């Protein structure tokens, strides 16, 4: 967006020496076929386990029984003959 | 950031203009680069596993 100087104008570009025209043109680089080499193993001996863990520990229980329940020799009360 | 790739820039050279050259004087270059050379098989899995 330059302003044209009317007192000192200039013309378009003139030819100048050039950079040997084939040396600015590249070759198209020619890929050969390739292979991810080797026979891959199916599994890996991992350093960490792959499953979930638990944040807190919960107390577990198992039921037990008591035993054969016996009789008893109670201390027996007195007879309510109007004193009680 | 802009790797020297002649597919991108055409022919590129490295220039040294020496001032004093003694006898048995050599220039020891050292490069570091990438190169691709495509592939068609990612396989190699034992099917009897």
Q: Give every CB contact of residue B2 below 8 A, 6+ residues apart in sequence.
A: none
Of A80, A54, A64, A26, nearest in space to B5 by CA: A26
Task: Name the closest residue on chain A to residue B45, using Cα atoms.
Answer: A40
Cα–Cα distances (Å) from A69 to A4, A6, A33, A42, in that order, read: 120, 126, 87, 62
CB crowding A9-24: b at 16 or more within 10 Å, else e: eeeeeeeeeeeeeeee
Residues of chain B positioned with their CB less than 8 A from the CB of A39: 44-46
What are the beta bridge partners of residue A40? B45
**For tokens 């109007």, what's the residue?**
A82
Distance CA B12, CA A26 (A): 11
**How far does B19 lie from chain A, in Å, by closest CA?**
26
What are the beta bridge partners of residue A35? B41
Q: How was this structure determined?
A: cryo-EM
In Å, the largest CA–CA distance within chain A is: 148
Cα B47 from chain centroid (whole Å): 39
Sign of CA dihedral B42, B46, B47, B49: negative
What are the beta bridge partners of residue B41? A35
- Cα torsion A38, A42, A48, A49 to 10°: value is 170
SS3 A21: helix
Of A24, A32, A33, nearest in space to B7 by CA: A24
**How far does B15 lie from chain A, in Å, by closest CA?**
16
Distance CA A11, CA B25 (A): 50
SS3 A40: strand
Token digits of residue A28 = 């198209």
State the resolution, in angstroms.
2.8
Among A27, A36, A43, the residue to mutate for chain B (most B Cβ within 10 A): A36
In Å, the largest CA–CA distance within chain B is: 69
| Total CB pairs under 8 A between chain A and B | 46
Query: What region does B7 belong to: left with phi over 0, alpha with psi -120 to 50, or beta?
Result: alpha
SS3 A22: helix
């Amino acid at each position: 967006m330059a302003l044209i100087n009317p007192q000192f104008p200039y013309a378009g570009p003139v030819p100048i020496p050039g950079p040997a025209p084939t040396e600015t043109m590249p070759l198209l680089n020619y890929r050969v076929e390739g292979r991810i080499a080797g026979i891959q193993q199916a599994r890996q001996f991992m350093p960490f386990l792959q499953g979930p863990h638990r944040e807190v520990a919960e107390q577990t229980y198992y039921a037990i029984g008591t035993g054969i329940q016996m009789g008893q020799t109670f201390n027996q009360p007195l007879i309510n003959t109007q004193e009680g | 950031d802009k790797p020297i790739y002649t597919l991108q820039y055409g022919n590129v050279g490295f220039v040294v203009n020496p001032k004093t050259v003694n006898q048995n004087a050599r220039l020891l270059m050292g490069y570091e680069y990438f190169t691709s050379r495509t592939e068609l098989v990612n396989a190699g899995t034992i099917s009897t596993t």
